[PDB]
Amino acid sequence: KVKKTTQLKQMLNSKDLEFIMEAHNGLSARIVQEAGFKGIWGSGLSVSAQLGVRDSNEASWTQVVEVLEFMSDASDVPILLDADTGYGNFNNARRLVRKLEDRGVAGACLEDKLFPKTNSLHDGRAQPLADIEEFALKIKACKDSQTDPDFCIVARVEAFIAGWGLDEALKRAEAYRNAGADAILMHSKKADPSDIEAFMKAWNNQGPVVIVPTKYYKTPTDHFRDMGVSMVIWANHNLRASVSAIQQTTKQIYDDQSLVNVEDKIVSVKEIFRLQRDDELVQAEDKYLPK
Amino acid sequence: KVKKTTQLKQMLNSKDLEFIMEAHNGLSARIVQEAGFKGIWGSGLSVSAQLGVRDSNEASWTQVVEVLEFMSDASDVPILLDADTGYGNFNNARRLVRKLEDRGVAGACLEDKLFPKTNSLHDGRAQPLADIEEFALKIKACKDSQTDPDFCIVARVEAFIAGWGLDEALKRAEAYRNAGADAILMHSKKADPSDIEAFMKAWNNQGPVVIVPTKYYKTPTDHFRDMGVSMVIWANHNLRASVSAIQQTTKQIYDDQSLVNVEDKIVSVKEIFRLQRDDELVQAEDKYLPK
Amino acid sequence: VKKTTQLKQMLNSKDLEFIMEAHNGLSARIVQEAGFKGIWGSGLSVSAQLGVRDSNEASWTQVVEVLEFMSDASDVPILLDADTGYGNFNNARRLVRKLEDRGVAGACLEDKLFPKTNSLHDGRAQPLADIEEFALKIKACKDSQTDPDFCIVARVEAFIAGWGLDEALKRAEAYRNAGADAILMHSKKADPSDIEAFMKAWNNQGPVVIVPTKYYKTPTDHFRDMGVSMVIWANHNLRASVSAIQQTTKQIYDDQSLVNVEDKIVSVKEIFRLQRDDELVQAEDKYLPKN
Amino acid sequence: VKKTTQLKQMLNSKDLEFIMEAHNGLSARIVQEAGFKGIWGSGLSVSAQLGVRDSNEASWTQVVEVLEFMSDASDVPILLDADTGYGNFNNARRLVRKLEDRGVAGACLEDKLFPKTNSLHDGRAQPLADIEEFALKIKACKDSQTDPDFCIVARVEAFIAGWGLDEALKRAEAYRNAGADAILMHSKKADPSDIEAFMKAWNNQGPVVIVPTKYYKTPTDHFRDMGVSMVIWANHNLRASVSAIQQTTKQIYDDQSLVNVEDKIVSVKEIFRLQRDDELVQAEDKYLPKN
């Protein structure tokens, strides 16, 4: 086999546009794999949401790592985890990376936002971000700490999101890429791809770029290919679909006080057993238990 | 407020047929609460499945307890946990109960099956179950250990499921109820309610009875009321609905390499924020952080 | 009388109180059997027993888990050194809630910037967290308690960070006005001069806790003369434990025998007693069939 | 050279080897610095440090977590006393896989029935797990290893449970034939007679590990004369640690002073060294902006 880390690294450096799909628990990870996706996106929003908490580092980094451990155990394709800012400074970030590596996770995506939120000024001006040298050094520490040379570090640049412009975005991307980032994730808050286009034009293909088209989803996918984008992340759609189904199913049963109107609309219990790989255990039990 | 334990206890002892809905993580727990359900069923099948593992005590009891801790943190109504056989003998069972009690879980359902599976004989005869006195004593230990007198212990009788008959079922139910069980969960493998009917007729209302109509779902709910059943558990439908939605959404995006055909079929990102109660944090940040 | 209340009464008592450091369930039980009315959950001791550095390497939930076993093993209150709350006010209050749920009696929070952001070690005074920011964190923790008697101790780092009496006084009054149950005043000196200066200037506005590790030759009655409320014996059990383990391990390594250690260590029977093994033997006799 | 391989070479070496008990990250590091080539992850020591009984009260994942910190803190192999694998063959192999992933080098499994099912303490010999069942558990563990050199030690309880040499021999051969890397032969006697009898009858079919705690006055060369492969110093660090903590805590309790302990315990500087604090100081200088 090919290591999961190697699988992800090849995807980031390939000449084709690659896609990874959001999963938020072991069950969704297996479903994503069975569908044919070559990679999984461990969404920070999805993992926190399934736990019932906010996407503001309320769950501890070890609790996040445990969710991902079950996800990694349930899939053969690489998982790239959204690790926010690394849960602290360079030291907390490299400790996280080593634990992820040991659990089979393929890479981690770190962002250059200030953590945690210390002020509440809600004006209309740009938001200060982590110092560029500090973040670049954080990326360097993670790369230096890896025991698997193919584990990936993706740097998420928050320049556009925070209200700054192309110049700030480019400076940060170049700095992180020079520090060893395996890819740059360029995001924006616009409902169109303009920030992405401006960046790809100025970037001059200095390294793989990852994008998240959630808000500009009507953009033709071939346009990303034309721009030389390396990977697209479908960020949170399984979580969103799960919520719609659970809200709908729950209301139906609540209203009917019966299962008649949901039984034919959901997978069978046997399909759950199949997704749990119950057959493999049945066989193991017949081989390892006395008759 | 009324303690969650008290809420569940009242439901088991009420004169009305009550209903609790399956939830398997913090997010589904909140959705179940928002729908109006007075209680939640922490399904052993659902919790293990969402983790990607089998429903054979592969996840440790503390890992199960952590999932339920997030569930309890995300709901105001009681959660009754399917705790299999208590993860060991009376001592492991009472330790589990105390930890559940401390995390806010309202009750636990324990079953009289042998644990773990030591043999593999796959004939067509009835399956040996835990010794009746041993299980009754286990129930007693849990009751004796409670620090909250309203925490509930539901005893699941496996007599029918294992191939024995009404007589064995009644003997076990009476024994567990005499040991202090707050309710008896009577289950069967039939696709009709015959075992349930035979039991309710012979039971002579010696205590609350809980049933799981998953396989005999076309039975009119009023029939359960006519039999004096105390509670109905809708066992695994949110999990089953979630899987259908995730499989469907994933395939669609996989096939289209676009989000156009799923965006209008799933809840919005803002609905996820609402379910995470992001607004409460925004307000807290404005009150507790310097401007 | 809850553990929280016990600790609150100690902080507000008219006598000098004492709490002994412990770092695991075993040592917490030993501190209790010795007669100490409270336990200090040392940040240095907990991280050291785990084998990591005292710089938030272990996650807050891993720390809470260590403390859970400690609380389960003791009947007297434990005051946890919670660093800066592991984040901003929201992380701090989530921590306080989990500690409350586990039976921990109080948390000590310090006003240092978190985490380390630069490595400049010139001679200047080290900047601390903003006073208003920390005061609000204390308030958020107090406002969040489900148990009115849970204690929040505010550790002032002014003297340590190189600032003067004016800063320490200023900080302490703000944290006390925000609701802190006590102020922990520390120094880097091998004499009690900073403490003496603070107590004189404080004018008994609230209970003061101190750690005399470095100025240990100062007579304890001197602290009583200054009106100090509580003394923390911060890390001697950890230090005694290391001395013992190093000596014992070396003896066995050199002798390739147990002959020279067997008579210098507690018997295996004492370990069983500390584990309350007889209690389980008695429970097994009651809850397991006699045959 | 992986830790697993190191342990395997020790079990199969031509010299008598020694492993020292440790129960947390700190003590594992101390055992390593002393020069020991291996560590014994004592079940009694791990449960005792947590403050619970040695009867699977702590969950297997909580035990694995303690061992994770131990493995992170040491470069030599750790052999974990894994009781009976925490369930049947499936629980055992899942445990082995998680231990492998954490860097643990081997697991010692015992053939006792689990868990306790009756409280009859007459005079008869205690029944053990079925020989075929346990042999198959060993095989399932061996078949499941991702690392060929991970070690499975089979602890035979025949002598302890009151059976004779014939039973011990019979069990050992079966577990050895199933693939066990070594046999741990234990006795309840204060003399080495059961071991002598077993070694004579064994005919060197495989490496044998022993625990001389109870017959500690027997000269070590005698074990070398019998062809014993490894000796386990089972619990002296835990015992030394309790002696130290009890004495230190009492001294401080009685004196209300540190004066009589300060010179008998290691300095705070030694704790920092053991924590590798300087290593972090150096990393901060490299990865944090100089200003």
JSON list of C-alpha atoms in Angstrom, two decimals, chain C residues 84-212:
[
{"chain": "C", "resi": 84, "resn": "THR", "atom": "CA", "xyz": [-4.70, 31.02, 32.60]},
{"chain": "C", "resi": 85, "resn": "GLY", "atom": "CA", "xyz": [-7.82, 28.99, 31.94]},
{"chain": "C", "resi": 86, "resn": "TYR", "atom": "CA", "xyz": [-6.45, 27.48, 28.71]},
{"chain": "C", "resi": 87, "resn": "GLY", "atom": "CA", "xyz": [-7.68, 30.29, 26.46]},
{"chain": "C", "resi": 88, "resn": "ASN", "atom": "CA", "xyz": [-9.94, 33.30, 26.87]},
{"chain": "C", "resi": 89, "resn": "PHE", "atom": "CA", "xyz": [-12.92, 33.71, 29.17]},
{"chain": "C", "resi": 90, "resn": "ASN", "atom": "CA", "xyz": [-14.97, 31.12, 27.30]},
{"chain": "C", "resi": 91, "resn": "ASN", "atom": "CA", "xyz": [-12.36, 28.37, 27.64]},
{"chain": "C", "resi": 92, "resn": "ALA", "atom": "CA", "xyz": [-11.94, 29.33, 31.28]},
{"chain": "C", "resi": 93, "resn": "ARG", "atom": "CA", "xyz": [-15.61, 29.05, 32.16]},
{"chain": "C", "resi": 94, "resn": "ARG", "atom": "CA", "xyz": [-16.01, 25.75, 30.28]},
{"chain": "C", "resi": 95, "resn": "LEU", "atom": "CA", "xyz": [-13.06, 24.48, 32.33]},
{"chain": "C", "resi": 96, "resn": "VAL", "atom": "CA", "xyz": [-14.63, 25.70, 35.58]},
{"chain": "C", "resi": 97, "resn": "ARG", "atom": "CA", "xyz": [-17.90, 23.91, 34.74]},
{"chain": "C", "resi": 98, "resn": "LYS", "atom": "CA", "xyz": [-16.17, 20.60, 34.00]},
{"chain": "C", "resi": 99, "resn": "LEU", "atom": "CA", "xyz": [-14.09, 20.92, 37.20]},
{"chain": "C", "resi": 100, "resn": "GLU", "atom": "CA", "xyz": [-17.28, 21.59, 39.21]},
{"chain": "C", "resi": 101, "resn": "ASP", "atom": "CA", "xyz": [-18.97, 18.51, 37.69]},
{"chain": "C", "resi": 102, "resn": "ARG", "atom": "CA", "xyz": [-15.93, 16.38, 38.65]},
{"chain": "C", "resi": 103, "resn": "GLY", "atom": "CA", "xyz": [-16.04, 17.45, 42.31]},
{"chain": "C", "resi": 104, "resn": "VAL", "atom": "CA", "xyz": [-13.02, 19.76, 42.13]},
{"chain": "C", "resi": 105, "resn": "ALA", "atom": "CA", "xyz": [-13.48, 22.63, 44.60]},
{"chain": "C", "resi": 106, "resn": "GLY", "atom": "CA", "xyz": [-11.75, 25.61, 43.03]},
{"chain": "C", "resi": 107, "resn": "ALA", "atom": "CA", "xyz": [-9.49, 26.84, 40.27]},
{"chain": "C", "resi": 108, "resn": "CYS", "atom": "CA", "xyz": [-6.50, 29.18, 40.45]},
{"chain": "C", "resi": 109, "resn": "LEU", "atom": "CA", "xyz": [-6.09, 31.36, 37.31]},
{"chain": "C", "resi": 110, "resn": "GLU", "atom": "CA", "xyz": [-3.00, 33.57, 36.65]},
{"chain": "C", "resi": 111, "resn": "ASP", "atom": "CA", "xyz": [-2.73, 36.82, 34.70]},
{"chain": "C", "resi": 112, "resn": "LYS", "atom": "CA", "xyz": [0.04, 35.91, 32.24]},
{"chain": "C", "resi": 113, "resn": "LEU", "atom": "CA", "xyz": [-0.17, 36.25, 28.46]},
{"chain": "C", "resi": 114, "resn": "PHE", "atom": "CA", "xyz": [-0.96, 32.87, 26.90]},
{"chain": "C", "resi": 115, "resn": "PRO", "atom": "CA", "xyz": [0.73, 31.33, 25.13]},
{"chain": "C", "resi": 116, "resn": "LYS", "atom": "CA", "xyz": [4.36, 32.43, 24.75]},
{"chain": "C", "resi": 117, "resn": "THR", "atom": "CA", "xyz": [4.64, 34.61, 21.63]},
{"chain": "C", "resi": 118, "resn": "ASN", "atom": "CA", "xyz": [8.30, 35.78, 21.57]},
{"chain": "C", "resi": 119, "resn": "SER", "atom": "CA", "xyz": [11.64, 34.54, 22.96]},
{"chain": "C", "resi": 120, "resn": "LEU", "atom": "CA", "xyz": [13.25, 37.81, 24.04]},
{"chain": "C", "resi": 121, "resn": "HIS", "atom": "CA", "xyz": [15.04, 37.35, 27.36]},
{"chain": "C", "resi": 122, "resn": "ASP", "atom": "CA", "xyz": [16.77, 40.69, 27.81]},
{"chain": "C", "resi": 123, "resn": "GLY", "atom": "CA", "xyz": [16.30, 42.44, 31.14]},
{"chain": "C", "resi": 124, "resn": "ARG", "atom": "CA", "xyz": [12.99, 44.32, 30.83]},
{"chain": "C", "resi": 125, "resn": "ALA", "atom": "CA", "xyz": [9.81, 43.50, 32.77]},
{"chain": "C", "resi": 126, "resn": "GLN", "atom": "CA", "xyz": [7.57, 40.91, 31.10]},
{"chain": "C", "resi": 127, "resn": "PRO", "atom": "CA", "xyz": [4.14, 42.16, 29.94]},
{"chain": "C", "resi": 128, "resn": "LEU", "atom": "CA", "xyz": [1.14, 40.42, 31.50]},
{"chain": "C", "resi": 129, "resn": "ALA", "atom": "CA", "xyz": [-2.43, 39.94, 30.40]},
{"chain": "C", "resi": 130, "resn": "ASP", "atom": "CA", "xyz": [-4.47, 43.15, 30.23]},
{"chain": "C", "resi": 131, "resn": "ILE", "atom": "CA", "xyz": [-5.98, 43.87, 33.64]},
{"chain": "C", "resi": 132, "resn": "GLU", "atom": "CA", "xyz": [-9.49, 44.47, 32.31]},
{"chain": "C", "resi": 133, "resn": "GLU", "atom": "CA", "xyz": [-9.34, 41.31, 30.19]},
{"chain": "C", "resi": 134, "resn": "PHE", "atom": "CA", "xyz": [-8.34, 39.11, 33.15]},
{"chain": "C", "resi": 135, "resn": "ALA", "atom": "CA", "xyz": [-10.83, 40.78, 35.50]},
{"chain": "C", "resi": 136, "resn": "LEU", "atom": "CA", "xyz": [-13.58, 39.96, 33.02]},
{"chain": "C", "resi": 137, "resn": "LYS", "atom": "CA", "xyz": [-12.38, 36.36, 32.75]},
{"chain": "C", "resi": 138, "resn": "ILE", "atom": "CA", "xyz": [-12.71, 36.05, 36.53]},
{"chain": "C", "resi": 139, "resn": "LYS", "atom": "CA", "xyz": [-16.21, 37.55, 36.33]},
{"chain": "C", "resi": 140, "resn": "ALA", "atom": "CA", "xyz": [-17.25, 35.20, 33.51]},
{"chain": "C", "resi": 141, "resn": "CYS", "atom": "CA", "xyz": [-16.09, 32.24, 35.62]},
{"chain": "C", "resi": 142, "resn": "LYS", "atom": "CA", "xyz": [-17.96, 33.45, 38.69]},
{"chain": "C", "resi": 143, "resn": "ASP", "atom": "CA", "xyz": [-21.11, 34.10, 36.62]},
{"chain": "C", "resi": 144, "resn": "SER", "atom": "CA", "xyz": [-20.91, 30.62, 35.11]},
{"chain": "C", "resi": 145, "resn": "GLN", "atom": "CA", "xyz": [-20.68, 28.52, 38.29]},
{"chain": "C", "resi": 146, "resn": "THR", "atom": "CA", "xyz": [-23.58, 26.19, 38.95]},
{"chain": "C", "resi": 147, "resn": "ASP", "atom": "CA", "xyz": [-22.28, 25.82, 42.54]},
{"chain": "C", "resi": 148, "resn": "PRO", "atom": "CA", "xyz": [-22.17, 29.16, 44.43]},
{"chain": "C", "resi": 149, "resn": "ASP", "atom": "CA", "xyz": [-19.35, 27.95, 46.66]},
{"chain": "C", "resi": 150, "resn": "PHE", "atom": "CA", "xyz": [-16.89, 26.89, 43.92]},
{"chain": "C", "resi": 151, "resn": "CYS", "atom": "CA", "xyz": [-13.77, 29.06, 44.39]},
{"chain": "C", "resi": 152, "resn": "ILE", "atom": "CA", "xyz": [-11.83, 31.16, 41.87]},
{"chain": "C", "resi": 153, "resn": "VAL", "atom": "CA", "xyz": [-8.38, 32.19, 43.12]},
{"chain": "C", "resi": 154, "resn": "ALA", "atom": "CA", "xyz": [-6.59, 34.91, 41.12]},
{"chain": "C", "resi": 155, "resn": "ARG", "atom": "CA", "xyz": [-2.85, 34.52, 41.00]},
{"chain": "C", "resi": 156, "resn": "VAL", "atom": "CA", "xyz": [-1.11, 37.95, 40.42]},
{"chain": "C", "resi": 157, "resn": "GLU", "atom": "CA", "xyz": [2.13, 37.79, 38.43]},
{"chain": "C", "resi": 158, "resn": "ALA", "atom": "CA", "xyz": [3.30, 41.42, 38.85]},
{"chain": "C", "resi": 159, "resn": "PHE", "atom": "CA", "xyz": [6.25, 40.72, 41.18]},
{"chain": "C", "resi": 160, "resn": "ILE", "atom": "CA", "xyz": [7.31, 37.65, 39.17]},
{"chain": "C", "resi": 161, "resn": "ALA", "atom": "CA", "xyz": [7.14, 39.53, 35.86]},
{"chain": "C", "resi": 162, "resn": "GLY", "atom": "CA", "xyz": [9.39, 42.23, 37.29]},
{"chain": "C", "resi": 163, "resn": "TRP", "atom": "CA", "xyz": [6.82, 44.94, 37.98]},
{"chain": "C", "resi": 164, "resn": "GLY", "atom": "CA", "xyz": [6.39, 46.57, 41.35]},
{"chain": "C", "resi": 165, "resn": "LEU", "atom": "CA", "xyz": [4.07, 46.75, 44.34]},
{"chain": "C", "resi": 166, "resn": "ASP", "atom": "CA", "xyz": [1.85, 49.29, 42.62]},
{"chain": "C", "resi": 167, "resn": "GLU", "atom": "CA", "xyz": [1.10, 46.85, 39.78]},
{"chain": "C", "resi": 168, "resn": "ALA", "atom": "CA", "xyz": [0.50, 43.92, 42.12]},
{"chain": "C", "resi": 169, "resn": "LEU", "atom": "CA", "xyz": [-1.85, 46.00, 44.26]},
{"chain": "C", "resi": 170, "resn": "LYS", "atom": "CA", "xyz": [-3.66, 47.35, 41.20]},
{"chain": "C", "resi": 171, "resn": "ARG", "atom": "CA", "xyz": [-4.13, 43.85, 39.74]},
{"chain": "C", "resi": 172, "resn": "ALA", "atom": "CA", "xyz": [-5.23, 42.25, 43.00]},
{"chain": "C", "resi": 173, "resn": "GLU", "atom": "CA", "xyz": [-7.91, 44.90, 43.68]},
{"chain": "C", "resi": 174, "resn": "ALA", "atom": "CA", "xyz": [-9.32, 44.51, 40.18]},
{"chain": "C", "resi": 175, "resn": "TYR", "atom": "CA", "xyz": [-9.48, 40.71, 40.40]},
{"chain": "C", "resi": 176, "resn": "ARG", "atom": "CA", "xyz": [-10.94, 40.90, 43.90]},
{"chain": "C", "resi": 177, "resn": "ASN", "atom": "CA", "xyz": [-13.52, 43.48, 42.74]},
{"chain": "C", "resi": 178, "resn": "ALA", "atom": "CA", "xyz": [-14.38, 41.15, 39.84]},
{"chain": "C", "resi": 179, "resn": "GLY", "atom": "CA", "xyz": [-15.32, 38.48, 42.34]},
{"chain": "C", "resi": 180, "resn": "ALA", "atom": "CA", "xyz": [-12.18, 36.43, 43.05]},
{"chain": "C", "resi": 181, "resn": "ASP", "atom": "CA", "xyz": [-12.55, 34.41, 46.25]},
{"chain": "C", "resi": 182, "resn": "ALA", "atom": "CA", "xyz": [-8.88, 34.98, 47.05]},
{"chain": "C", "resi": 183, "resn": "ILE", "atom": "CA", "xyz": [-5.65, 36.44, 45.72]},
{"chain": "C", "resi": 184, "resn": "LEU", "atom": "CA", "xyz": [-2.53, 34.30, 45.41]},
{"chain": "C", "resi": 185, "resn": "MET", "atom": "CA", "xyz": [0.50, 36.59, 45.71]},
{"chain": "C", "resi": 186, "resn": "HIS", "atom": "CA", "xyz": [3.78, 35.16, 44.57]},
{"chain": "C", "resi": 187, "resn": "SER", "atom": "CA", "xyz": [7.39, 36.29, 44.41]},
{"chain": "C", "resi": 188, "resn": "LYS", "atom": "CA", "xyz": [10.74, 35.19, 42.93]},
{"chain": "C", "resi": 189, "resn": "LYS", "atom": "CA", "xyz": [12.63, 36.13, 46.10]},
{"chain": "C", "resi": 190, "resn": "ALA", "atom": "CA", "xyz": [14.22, 33.86, 48.70]},
{"chain": "C", "resi": 191, "resn": "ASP", "atom": "CA", "xyz": [12.73, 36.13, 51.35]},
{"chain": "C", "resi": 192, "resn": "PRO", "atom": "CA", "xyz": [9.14, 37.24, 52.15]},
{"chain": "C", "resi": 193, "resn": "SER", "atom": "CA", "xyz": [9.69, 40.95, 51.39]},
{"chain": "C", "resi": 194, "resn": "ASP", "atom": "CA", "xyz": [7.28, 41.25, 48.44]},
{"chain": "C", "resi": 195, "resn": "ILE", "atom": "CA", "xyz": [4.59, 39.51, 50.49]},
{"chain": "C", "resi": 196, "resn": "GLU", "atom": "CA", "xyz": [5.21, 41.75, 53.50]},
{"chain": "C", "resi": 197, "resn": "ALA", "atom": "CA", "xyz": [5.00, 44.81, 51.26]},
{"chain": "C", "resi": 198, "resn": "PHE", "atom": "CA", "xyz": [1.78, 43.59, 49.65]},
{"chain": "C", "resi": 199, "resn": "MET", "atom": "CA", "xyz": [0.07, 42.63, 52.90]},
{"chain": "C", "resi": 200, "resn": "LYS", "atom": "CA", "xyz": [0.85, 46.07, 54.35]},
{"chain": "C", "resi": 201, "resn": "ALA", "atom": "CA", "xyz": [-0.61, 47.81, 51.29]},
{"chain": "C", "resi": 202, "resn": "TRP", "atom": "CA", "xyz": [-3.56, 45.40, 50.82]},
{"chain": "C", "resi": 203, "resn": "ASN", "atom": "CA", "xyz": [-5.42, 46.47, 53.98]},
{"chain": "C", "resi": 204, "resn": "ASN", "atom": "CA", "xyz": [-7.12, 43.08, 54.24]},
{"chain": "C", "resi": 205, "resn": "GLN", "atom": "CA", "xyz": [-9.43, 43.69, 51.27]},
{"chain": "C", "resi": 206, "resn": "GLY", "atom": "CA", "xyz": [-9.66, 39.92, 50.84]},
{"chain": "C", "resi": 207, "resn": "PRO", "atom": "CA", "xyz": [-8.09, 36.51, 51.60]},
{"chain": "C", "resi": 208, "resn": "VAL", "atom": "CA", "xyz": [-4.50, 36.12, 50.44]},
{"chain": "C", "resi": 209, "resn": "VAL", "atom": "CA", "xyz": [-2.84, 32.83, 49.54]},
{"chain": "C", "resi": 210, "resn": "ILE", "atom": "CA", "xyz": [0.97, 32.42, 49.34]},
{"chain": "C", "resi": 211, "resn": "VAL", "atom": "CA", "xyz": [3.53, 29.78, 48.32]},
{"chain": "C", "resi": 212, "resn": "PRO", "atom": "CA", "xyz": [6.60, 29.85, 50.62]}
]
